[PDB]
């Protein structure tokens, strides 16, 4: 199992090598359209692209490209869209994806500024009064409310198709205390956050796939999905032992490159899943322990 494996890797200090095998075994698929000249300003990082086979296509004549991938987890029956943080020129496309993909939730795992640089455009309105309009995609976005907690913030937004005057409620779950290439403060705050997302219905199959992003859409986003999928599988067969994390991760990496960016992010994934297993297997009290230990208020 994973807990025994976790200790075996730990007490030998071999996470770097376990993580490197994963890196070495990971799928390599082509990213032809990401690399087209006409798409250079649509990509935040040169070395982070969506595979053609799993990329999300914008529904438009002109240019249907966005740096976003559908990760479709067959056995788990969960899909996620992983994407880079929007660029000043792709905030319209981003909100277009969300509309067309019928997404209910957006999980943001980074801050707009980290380490003195700009990791993501300010793609949602910070004030109720000052809604945003995306003229290129004919979408309007309004802040309806927010709930600021100590290390994450939840917002309600209303997205309007200005063409059909049709509106939707989107939930924005914003984790504000996770350093790029880092890990969360502890399993508890991460898990408390994950279960907040779940409790919202954002991950439910009656909606389009959740949009998950960090700066690149792979390190912190990969960590989130991996843990979520792993806990889901464990829940579905109520068998902690049947779940092989490394194998789930390799499965996810068929759909987008680079998922989990450091060995420590891998170790943390193990950690989060092992701790989340408690709740899955019938210990309802741990959720309240996570809320306390997270120091939410
Ligand atoms: N080195 C390219 C590169 C740049 C940024 C990232 N960030 C993330 O995955 C993240 O936001 O966690 C990952 C890879
Ligand atoms: Mg105000």
UniProtKB/Swiss-Prot annotation:
Keyword Acetylation among UniProt keywords: yes
Modified residues (Cysteine sulfenic acid (-SOH)): 214
Residue sites binding substrate per the record: 180, 214-220, 261
PTM: Oxidized on Cys-214; the Cys-SOH formed in response to redox signaling reacts with the alpha-amido of the following residue to form a sulfenamide cross-link, triggering a conformational change that inhibits substrate binding and activity. The active site can be restored by reduction.
Subcellular location: Endoplasmic reticulum membrane
Example of a GO cellular component annotation carried by this entry: endosome lumen
Record cross-link N,N-(cysteine-1,S-diyl)serine (Cys-Ser), residues: 214-215
Phosphoserine: residues carrying this PTM: 49, 241-242
Family the entry assigns: Belongs to the protein-tyrosine phosphatase family. Non-receptor class 1 subfamily.
Role, per record: Tyrosine-protein phosphatase which acts as a regulator of endoplasmic reticulum unfolded protein response. Mediates dephosphorylation of EIF2AK3/PERK; inactivating the protein kinase activity of EIF2AK3/PERK. May play an important role in CKII- and p60c-src-induced signal transduction cascades. May regulate the EFNA5-EPHA3 signaling pathway which modulates cell reorganization and cell-cell repulsion. May also regulate the hepatocyte growth factor receptor signaling pathway through dephosphorylation of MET.
Quaternary structure (record): Interacts with EPHA3 (phosphorylated); dephosphorylates EPHA3 and may regulate its trafficking and function. Interacts with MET. Interacts with NCK1.
Protein name: Tyrosine-protein phosphatase non-receptor type 1
Gene: PTPN1
Portion of the full sequence shown: 2 to 298 of 435
